[PDB]
Subunit: 339 residues, 2 copies
Amino acid sequence: AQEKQDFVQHFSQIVRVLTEDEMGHPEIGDAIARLKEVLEYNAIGGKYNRGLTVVVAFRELVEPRKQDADSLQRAWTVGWCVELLQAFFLVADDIMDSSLTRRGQICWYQKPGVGLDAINDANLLEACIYRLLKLYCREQPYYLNLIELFLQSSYQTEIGQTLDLLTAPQGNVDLVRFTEKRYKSIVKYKTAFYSFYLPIAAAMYMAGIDGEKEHANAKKILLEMGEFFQIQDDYLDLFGDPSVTGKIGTDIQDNKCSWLVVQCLQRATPEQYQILKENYGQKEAEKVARVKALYEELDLPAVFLQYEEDSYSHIMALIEQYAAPLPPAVFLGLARKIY
Amino acid sequence: AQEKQDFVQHFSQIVRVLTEDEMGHPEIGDAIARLKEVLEYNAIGGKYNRGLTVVVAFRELVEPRKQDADSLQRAWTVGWCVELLQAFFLVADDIMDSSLTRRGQICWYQKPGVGLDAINDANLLEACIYRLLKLYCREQPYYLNLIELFLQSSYQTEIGQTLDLLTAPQGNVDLVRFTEKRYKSIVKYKTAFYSFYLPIAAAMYMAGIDGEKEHANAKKILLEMGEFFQIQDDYLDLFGDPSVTGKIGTDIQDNKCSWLVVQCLQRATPEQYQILKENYGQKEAEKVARVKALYEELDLPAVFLQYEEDSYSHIMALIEQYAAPLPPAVFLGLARKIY
Ligand SMILES: [Mg+2]
Ligand SMILES: [Mg+2]
């Protein structure tokens, strides 16, 4: 909320530190300038919810007598690592989907004189994560824990992306691969691990809570939250209010494996399957319009409303069962935001 | 030599291990199949000199009584990690340069139905490195040492690539940035660190030789070897015998910051600067032909021959000064190969 503004003032330092360390290394200066420009363009401009979840979870987890200036600096920094992870995926995903814009502005790769060099820029964003961890956390006992958490998060995200790409190739309608089992799997690997587990898990490690069982417990809660966030993201893509949401969805144009299309397909009498087969994923409006209306005719907006109520109950039951011995608030803060 | 065939039989195991671990995870199977195909296509087909340098250096470094079946399995595996690092860079560099072929065959990204998804495939190759290290080396005392060595190698390579891209944009002649200082810097960061330091450094760590001073010593030797390898690569690109080398060079078409162009520019009377300005980096033959002949007229092939003699002396002096207490053979094996 106000904690945000603080997180963002810290970026300047993040950047300073990552774009200087050549003082006996002159000649690489120009690549360092380019790294400065990649960071400023790609890490800034989002809502920062993931990085901040790190900072908030850290405050709530650490028995207050161990929060000095330096401990807090390590939390802002690790929060910024989560944001750099995000940045890395987005720069790359935008190239792969040929997107035009991101966070309201021109995608980095679409900028004149960047193009496919953005592939190296994305790799730099990733590498910046480990450079930060070494700079700030090298002497901490949880250092290796965090390196492995970031590496694993990346791999989960990447393999989820591979699954998404095998499942939903833009320009090729095949709804035989749009199943519930496959929708759930994409979300867990591609979105939920890094969006929800990673930031809390990182806070836990910084707090000394490294147990397998405790982490599995938190993960159970957080992956289920992640599933909901994304299902809500998909519903709102089409049925959101663009003023409240902040852009019009193209999930259906893009032949996305949307929670909607999945639900739609669970409920289609053979004709409707065809109505969807001849309309899902097309440039033109009348085709998208007709899909939205098919959705409305199956009362998907109400299936969603029912799903969200149930899902909310279920999350609370999960917090009740699996939060201890972590303060339930760690999870409830995130529930409040996503619901 | 014969040690090679062995390294390559081990690949099958590498792959098996990386493409199975879902046995309670069914639904991600298909992404794992795709990962299998990325590994088989991208990690196989080269000379394997870097991975093998790991295995050879490990045998020479470890006091022979600590080489059991498992220690050796960790060396083959870490050798394969170096090869996966290589694979990751190449898949990505080939997209960025829009190359057509690699190791005689169609670049992965040019394959039908791959295209820019190869960006996620490259990221997977990178992630496979850390998955292998965790699988085989997690309980070793040098585990963190190796994770940091691979991460640093990647960052050095990436930032070198950024410098190369700022220096030599394909389609834009500017020879004011082709300096000796800038040529040397590109090679150190882009090529030599990962090609020469990384494999030996990794062997050292597996052997318990983790000292800062010893590593700086080996690095001094190995970066200088790397500079020579690349300078020889550039010379041979144009003056090599295509039967002995194995392809015709396009360095001059590609407006590469070649050691040649650099030398050429150190020796050009103002007219010649123009002769190069109006001919470097063009599609057509007559333009390339004319550059080759300008090079021949400056006796670059002899400047090279003189450079290689001096460089050889210098490497031997470096081994003499900086090898101890490592067996000089560790370095001499590599000298024999590159010279
Ligand atoms: Mg969406
Ligand atoms: Mg070459």
